[PDB]
Amino acid sequence: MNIFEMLRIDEGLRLKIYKDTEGYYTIGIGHLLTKSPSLNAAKSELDKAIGRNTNGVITKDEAEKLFNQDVDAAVRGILRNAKLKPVYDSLDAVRRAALINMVFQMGETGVAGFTNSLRMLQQKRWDEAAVNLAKSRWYNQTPNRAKRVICTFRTGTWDAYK
Ligand SMILES: *SCC1=CC(C)(C)N(O)C1(C)C
Ligand SMILES: [Cl-]
């Protein structure tokens, strides 16, 4: 298991524009296009991201290219962030994947707001961090996925995903 397979499991793969759990226009492997309610705005974003006139449908190769870029961006967002970098640096390789998963889903700003959870992770208080992590809009809106990411933080294994 690795971060790409992990996020592939959580985000799925759709080759046509769809609405994510929040109702936002999205495509491929959880690639957010826009928060605007306009399908045309979304198609325009898609054409721009892919570099061709798509009409809302992309290929698997294109979905995967967007995915590669998004994972790379998430990782680099963490490394450039002053609240996130220290936590990442302190974690083992499995739990690092968990952090990348959160950032991928809710953004660098969003994760950096889990101030208390981040401090417990740095101290390696896994059970305590798990409980604090569950007290969140994130957990209540997407329980199954949050559970998987939280269990990963708690155990340091890939068991939530096998
Ligand atoms: S999060 C899943 C999990 C963690 C731990 C506390 C080690 N468990 O006993 C289960 C398998 C419930
Ligand atoms: Cl879910």
Residue 135 CB neighbours (<10 A) = 12
97/71 Cα distance (integer angstroms)? 10
- Residue position matching structure tokens 């970098």: 85
25/34 Cα distance (integer angstroms)? 6
Ramachandran class of 124: left when φ > 0, alpha when ψ lies in -120 to 50, beta otherwise: left
Tokens coding 14: 């759709």
Domains and CATH numbers, the chain: 1-162 (1.10.530.40)
Residue 13 CB neighbours (<10 A) = 13
Resolution of the experimental structure, in angstroms:
2.3
- Residue position matching structure tokens 């995903």: 161
Centroid of ligand 2 to alpha carbon of 84 (angstroms): 24
Mutate to test the pocket of ligand 1, among 131, 145, 151 (most ligand atoms within 8 A of CB): 151
Cβ 54 vs Cβ 43: under 8 Å: yes
Does the C-beta of 155 come closer than 6 Å to ligand 1?
yes
Cβ 139 vs Cβ 117: under 8 Å: no
Q: Which amino acid is at 89?
A: D
Strand pairing category for 14-19 and 31-34: unpaired
Instruction: Give the length of the chain.
Output: 162
The 8-class DSSP code of residue 161 comes to G
CA angle 1, 70, 136 (to 5 degrees): 75
Which of 40, 41, 39, 45 is closest to 18 using CA atoms? 39
101/95 Cα distance (integer angstroms)? 10
Q: How was this structure obtained?
A: X-ray
